[PDB]
């Protein structure tokens, strides 16, 4: 059947599920995730490779398959770039929002102090 890996979002040939969260993964990614991060990737709990339960279970032209790789690799790298570009834009929106917030606190601080003067005019 079709199974979707939680890390890649791709159809996987080797679907495996972790007992610490119940999300399906490609075995190879989650083992590399565990071997690098130690946690479950979705629930962030401690995980280990023995806690993984395996789920149950054409060719056309080599010049074509090599061109399917080329186009598919460009799509994977395009995505990775747009994520780095989108992540900096999110940080730029975030840091601007904090500046507006901190400037507003200074204004509210300034005005609230000035409002004390009206009690001693």
């Amino acid at each position: 059947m079709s199974f979707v890996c939680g890390i890649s979002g791709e159809l996987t040939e080797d679907p495996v599920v972790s007992q610490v969260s119940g999300h399906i993964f490609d075995r190879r990614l989650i083992v590399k995730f565990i071997a690098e991060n130690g946690t479950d990737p979705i629930s962030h709990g401690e995980l280990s490779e023995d806690q993984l339960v395996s789920l149950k279970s054409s060719g056309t032209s080599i010049p074509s398959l090599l061109k399917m790789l080329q186009d598919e690799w460009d799509t994977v790298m395009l995505n990775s770039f747009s994520l780095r570009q989108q992540l900096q834009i999110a940080r730029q929106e975030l840091s601007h929002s904090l500046y507006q917030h901190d400037a507003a606190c200074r204004v509210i601080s300034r005005l609230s102090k000035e409002l004390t003067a009206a009690r001693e005019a």
Binding site: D74, T75, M77, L78, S80, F81, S82, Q85
Partner: protein, 60 residues
């Protein structure tokens, strides 16, 4: 142009790691490859004598 930007980034990361470890791994590769050559020349020499021994047993 976005896709090539990431290929070049991954190329740089590969090249920088390659600058740390290529010299060692190529040296290690040659040290394994050298062993195969000597061991192959051992097999070549060993079989040559056996062919020669058959010529001996024929002449005798």
């Amino acid at each position: 142009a976005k896709a090539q930007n990431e290929h070049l980034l991954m190329r740089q990361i590969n090249l920088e790691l390659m600058d740390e470890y290529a010299a060692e791994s190529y040296l290690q590769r040659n040290k394994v490859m050298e062993d195969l050559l000597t061991h192959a020349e051992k097999e070549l020499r060993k079989t040559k004598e056996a062919v020669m021994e058959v010529h001996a047993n024929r002449k005798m």
